[PDB]
Amino acid sequence: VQSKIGSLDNITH
Amino acid sequence: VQSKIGSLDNITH
Amino acid sequence: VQSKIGSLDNITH
Amino acid sequence: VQSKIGSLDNITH
Amino acid sequence: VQSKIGSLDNITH
Amino acid sequence: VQSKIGSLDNITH
Amino acid sequence: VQSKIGSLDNITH
Amino acid sequence: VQSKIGSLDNITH
Amino acid sequence: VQSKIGSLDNITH
Amino acid sequence: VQSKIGSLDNITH
Amino acid sequence: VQSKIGSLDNITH
Amino acid sequence: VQSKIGSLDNITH
Amino acid sequence: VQSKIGSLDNITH
Amino acid sequence: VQSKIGSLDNITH
Amino acid sequence: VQSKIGSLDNITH
Amino acid sequence: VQSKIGSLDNITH
Amino acid sequence: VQSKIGSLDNITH
Amino acid sequence: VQSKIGSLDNITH
């Protein structure tokens, strides 16, 4: 409800 | 409800 | 509810 | 049983 | 049983 | 039983 | 809800 | 909710 | 909620 | 669920 | 759930 | 849940 | 949502 | 949500 | 939420 | 759910 | 749930 | 839940 997600996982090899 | 998703996974090899 | 997530995991090899 | 309501799953391997 | 209502699944391999 | 309501799961391996 | 399960295995990666 | 389960294994990585 | 489980194993990594 | 009502009797004069 | 009501009786005169 | 009501009786004159 | 689900109504006048 | 779920109503006048 | 869940109402006048 | 109600009058006899 | 109600009057006899 | 109510009057006889 009126929320945001930018990123959950940022997996950089 | 009135929410946003920008990105979940950003997997860069 | 009116919350934000910037990032959960930042896994840099 | 083994159900979901309003959930978010981000499964990565 | 083994059902979903209003969910988001992001499964990556 | 073994259910979810409004949850977020981020499982990484 | 009436449910019967003989055996349940949840494996997540 | 009435539930019956013989055996339950949850393995998470 | 009425529940019956014979054996329950939760393994988390 | 697995319930009983011995008699549902509503009389108005 | 597995309950009883011996008699549901509502009389109005 | 596994409960009883011996008699539900409401009379109005 | 905004419904009458699994209910019993006994209205007398 | 905003519902009547699994309820019994016995209204007399 | 804002509901009547698993309730019994016995209203007489 | 995005509900709007102007006015709700409920009388039970 | 995003509910709005102007005024709620409830009378029970 | 994001609820708004202007005024709630409740009378029980």
Author numbering:
A (entry chain L), B (entry chain R), C (entry chain F), D (entry chain K), E (entry chain Q), F (entry chain E), ...: 350 to 362
Copied sentences from the primary study:
Functional tau is most abundant in neuronal axons where it binds to microtubules, assists microtubule assembly, and is essential for the structural integrity of neurons and for axonal transport. Here, we identify a new amyloidogenic segment, PAM4 (Polymorphic AMyloid segment in repeat 4), encompassing residues 350–362 of R4, and show that it self-assembles into amyloid fibrils. Cryo-EM revealed that PAM4 fibrils are highly polymorphic, and, remarkably, that the polymorphs formed by this segment in isolation recapitulate the conformations that PAM4 adopts in polymorphs from different human tauopathies.
We also determined the structure of PAM4 amyloid fibrils formed by a lower purity (92%) peptide batch. Two-dimensional (2D) classification revealed that this peptide batch also formed multiple fibril polymorphs, with three distinct PAM4 fibril structures that could be determined to high resolution. The most abundant polymorph, PAM4 Type 2 (representing 28% of the total population), was resolved to a resolution of 2.8 Å. This polymorph has six peptide subunits per layer with a helical twist and rise of 358.55° and 4.8 Å, respectively, corresponding to a crossover distance of 60 nm. Finally, FoldD PAM4 matches R2:R3:R4 (4R) tau strains that are associated with corticobasal degeneration (CBD) and argyrophilic grain disease (AGD). Specifically, the FoldC conformation of PAM4 stabilised by the K353-D358 salt-bridge is also found in tau C-fold protofilament polymorphs linked to Alzheimer’s disease (AD), Gerstmann-Sträussler-Scheinker (GSS), primary age-related tauopathy (PART) and cerebral amyloid angiopathy (CAA), while showing reasonable fit to chronic traumatic encephalopathy (CTE) polymorphs.
